[PDB]
Amino acid sequence: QGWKQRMAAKELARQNMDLGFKLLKKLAFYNPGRNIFLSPLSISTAFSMLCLGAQDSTLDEIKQGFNFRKMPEKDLHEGFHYIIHELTQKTQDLKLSIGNTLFIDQRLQPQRKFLEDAKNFYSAETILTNFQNLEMAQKQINDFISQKTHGKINNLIENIDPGTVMLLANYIFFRARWKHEFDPNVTKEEDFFLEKNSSVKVPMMFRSGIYQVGYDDKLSCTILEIPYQKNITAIFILPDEGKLKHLEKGLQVDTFSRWKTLLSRRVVDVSVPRLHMTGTFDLKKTLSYIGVSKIFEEHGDLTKIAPHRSLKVGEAVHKAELKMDERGTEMETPLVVKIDKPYLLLIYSEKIPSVLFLGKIVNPIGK
């Protein structure tokens, strides 16, 4: 039985939810007017995986920053292994992979125990690279990742600092069928208001059907859920005019559970833009938002990864990628939910609890 693993996953999912909202708040504060697209879950797997090879102050700070402190470490790794194993699929309904690749300088010797544990618990791999040729190391890493993800995760690395002997690449892609397909013949170019006064034409999908829908008077936003065929849900959060900043600032762990209380199944005429979203983050910068930096410094804390005095993670990048289109399986007067102005998007795994993706979409066709 995997009861205990399932309980650990439930606690870890609450933690990625909080992490996602904290990261979104900080990212939106420093960079307003930009799309933000990342996977709190995928980011968490990367640093939890690093806990298998980290000791002392570096280990303690990752666990403090990511709030991995509530359960024993054995349960932390068993919980993440369960989440990854359950979500990892290449079926007609769902294609999801969480990649964790450490690229280590070929002069270093990654330790067997760490290699085995990372592969067994996270499906993470270590690839030897020649960091003395930075240009070639970048092409090698980008080609390795593009080949592994079948062209879903491309150009992951744009720069490698000299002296880097260890680079972490974390990446997640998603393809899923909706529980009910949208008819592509009904998809049309429609106005997407970038601002109250300024608009761009975007491919807008349309379907009339039964959906979990609601309105939050506290955060002044419409909530709409569109289910995928597998137990995953696309949650659209549409702020009222001039309430986006209020919505971002009000986001909490309790916010989400409150949104769930406001929903009911109703007939809705839904208009949703198609998306092909990617988000790329320098994790050294992103993790400063949760006070995690020792992993990026030399402290003699990574000997379990490889013996070497000055060892640190030189660089770490996260890339999240998702396609949202018509693909899927197959009363009362309809409500109308038009997603045609800046919105938040949460891709939520219901069965294996987790926030797979969190997005702030200011422009669905925006790069």
From Swiss-Prot:
Tell me what effect the entry lists for residue 329 to R: Fails to inhibit KLK7 activity. Increased protein stability in cleaved form and conformational changes which may allow escape of the substrate
Q: GO CC: one term?
A: extracellular space
Thermal response of activity: Highly thermostable, with a Tm value of 70 degrees Celsius. Incubation at 60 degrees Celsius for two hours has no apparent effect on KLK7 inhibition activity. Polymerization is observed at 70 degrees Celsius and above.
Write down what this protein is called: Serpin A12
What the entry says about post-translational processing?
Answer: Glycosylation slightly decreases affinity for heparin, but otherwise has no significant effect on KLK7 inhibitory activity or thermal stability of the protein.
Q: Name one GO molecular function term.
A: molecular function inhibitor activity
Question: Which Pfam families does the entry link to?
Answer: Serpin
Please name the GO terms of the biological process aspect recorded for this protein, alphabetically: gluconeogenesis; lipid biosynthetic process; negative regulation of gluconeogenesis; negative regulation of lipid biosynthetic process; phosphatidylinositol 3-kinase/protein kinase B signal transduction; positive regulation of insulin receptor signaling pathway; positive regulation of phosphatidylinositol 3-kinase/protein kinase B signal transduction; regulation of cholesterol metabolic process
Q: What does this protein do?
A: Adipokine that modulates insulin action by specifically inhibiting its target protease KLK7 in white adipose tissues.
Q: Which family does it belong to?
A: Belongs to the serpin family.
Complex formation: Forms a stable complex with KLK7.
Tissue expression: Expressed in visceral adipose tissues.
| Outcome when changing residue 332 to S | Significantly enhances KLK7 inhibition activity. Slightly enhances KLK7 inhibition activity
Indicate how activity is controlled: Inhibition of KLK7 is enhanced by heparin.
Keywords on record: Glycoprotein, Protease inhibitor, Secreted, Serine protease inhibitor, Signal
Describe what happens upon changing residue 336 to C: Results in formation of an artificial disulfide bond which stabilizes the reactive center loop and enhances KLK7 inhibition activity
Sites of glycosylation?
185, 197, 231
Where is the protein localized?
Secreted
Top-level taxon of origin = Eukaryota
Q: Which InterPro entries match?
A: Serpin_dom (IPR023796), Serpin_fam (IPR000215), Serpin_sf (IPR036186), Serpin_sf_1 (IPR042178), Serpin_sf_2 (IPR042185)
Q: Which residues form a coiled coil?
A: none
